[PDB]
């Protein structure tokens, strides 16, 4: 519906161009605003671009000392947010918000911007098994996803899904020392779907680094 892209890890002083592409409706009849959210905080208006009818007039938050440019490609049906001289404090989820022509007041899914001089670090992913007896008829297995940077985007999927299958994902938390993050992903599934001798896979997609497929044996 409203597809966002362009986010990523960028060094301070860097540049990024964010896209807000409308899929299955015109964007020209509406005003496009950009709103941000730093992880664990509220909402902060960044700027807006008025409709082609209102001659694409732009307005920005004064705090962003002329570092942003909001533009629109009416042929591509996309609105953009170009950010320059990036600051550590620009780290946030950026959303585009539509106003006027319907879908009115609708927000995009967000695109993440991380501004840091810290180098990306791939997670150290490990299989986790219970030492004890399994819960009656269910199998509980996990994957440790250790020492990674940036904290997001990080996604974990398992090779088993369906009825009686529950995947539990936890927000990363900062490690004791340094800039690294750690989390785990847990899978509960029927014993029948994880028979003795079988193995399962947790698939870990982190930022732009190649995905990791880790084998976890069934008990």
């Amino acid at each position: 519906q409203l597809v966002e892209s362009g986010g990523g890890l960028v060094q301070p002083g860097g540049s990024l161009k964010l896209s807000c592409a409308a899929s299955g409706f015109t964007l020209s009849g509406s005003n496009v605003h950009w709103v941000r959210q730093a992880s664990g905080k509220g909402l902060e208006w960044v700027g807006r671009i008025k409709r082609n009818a209102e001659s694409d007039a732009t307005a920005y938050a004064a705090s962003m000392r002329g570092r942003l440019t909001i533009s629109r490609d009416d042929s591509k049906n996309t609105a953009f947010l170009q950010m320059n001289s990036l600051k550590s404090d620009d780290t946030a989820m950026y959303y585009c918000v539509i106003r006027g022509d319907v879908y009115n007041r609708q927000w995009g899914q967000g695109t993440l911007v991380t501004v840091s001089s810290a180098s990306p670090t791939s997670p150290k992913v490990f299989p986790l098994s219970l030492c004890s007896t399994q819960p009656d008829g269910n199998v509980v297995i996990a994957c440790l996803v250790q020492g990674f940077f940036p904290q997001e985007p990080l996604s974990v999927t398992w090779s088993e899904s369906g009825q009686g299958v529950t995947a539990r994902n936890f927000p990363p938390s900062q490690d004791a020392s340094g800039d690294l993050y750690t989390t785990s992903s847990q899978l509960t599934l029927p014993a029948t779907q994880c028979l003795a001798g079988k193995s399962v896979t947790c698939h870990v997609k982190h930022y732009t680094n190649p995905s990791q497929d880790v084998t976890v044996p069934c008990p």
């Binding site: 909402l43 007041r105 030492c131 509980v140 250790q146 989390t183």
Partner: protein, 219 residues
């Protein structure tokens, strides 16, 4: 810039009970047409904000009849007649009178379900990780309410004041429970010098603390 102040900043309401959120603006949001330039958004865990109320009182498309917005000028109120599991999240008021568009701090709504003790699972370090010279012990807590849970790590029955990190999921939109991941990270050298590894959980739904433990290598 128009200042939006929300009150209270958090609520814990039992299902079926009403809830109300106050929003006060620093300038009047009353229009020439009579209506008010005040909006209300809900941001559910893991999602982007969604409109609820616009123009001070207009209930957005597909927003249940249980949500209402009232007030004029500088004082507004979002009312929820009967709170449900799915209402969990952070509510924001927004003024659309002038630019910069400004939002309130956000009010988190917790759904106050019945006490639910966690299911606790302990995962020893995998040999794969031990090879690298680091040892992480994982303690997972599942589907508990309230959020207050204390996780204590014991090594050969001696309490740890450091070496651990945890993360808690946001309140589940369906069952209103929380889940927690606690990780104790030791060096391989330290891990190899001790035998009994335990996580002790204290929660309201437990008669006394639950300890899940294992002996190094006896797995």
């Amino acid at each position: 810039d128009i200042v939006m102040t929300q009150s209270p900043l958090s609520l814990s309401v039992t299902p079926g009970e009403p809830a109300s959120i106050s929003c006060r603006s620093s300038q009047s949001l009353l229009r020439r047409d009579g209506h008010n330039d005040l909006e209300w958004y809900l941001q559910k865990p893991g999602q982007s904000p969604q409109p609820l109320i616009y123009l001070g009182s207009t209930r957005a498309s597909g927003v249940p009849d249980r949500f209402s917005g009232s007030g004029s000028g500088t004082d507004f109120t979002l009312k929820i007649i009967r709170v449900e599991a799915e209402d969990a999240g952070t509510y924001y008021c927004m003024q659309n009178k002038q630019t910069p568009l400004t939002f309130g701090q956000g009010t988190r709504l917790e759904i106050k379900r019945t006490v639910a003790a966690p299911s606790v699972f302990i995962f020893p370090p995998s040999d794969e990780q031990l090879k690298s010279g680091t040892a992480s012990v994982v303690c997972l807590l599942n589907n508990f309410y309230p959020r207050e849970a204390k996780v204590q790590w014991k090594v050969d029955n001696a309490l740890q004041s450091g070496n651990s990190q945890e993360s808690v999921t946001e309140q589940d939109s369906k069952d209103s429970t929380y889940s927690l991941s606690s990780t104790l990270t030791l060096s391989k050298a330290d891990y190899e010098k001790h035998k009994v590894y335990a996580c002790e959980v204290t929660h309201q739904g437990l008669s006394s603390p639950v300890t899940k433990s294992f002996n190094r290598g006896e797995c």
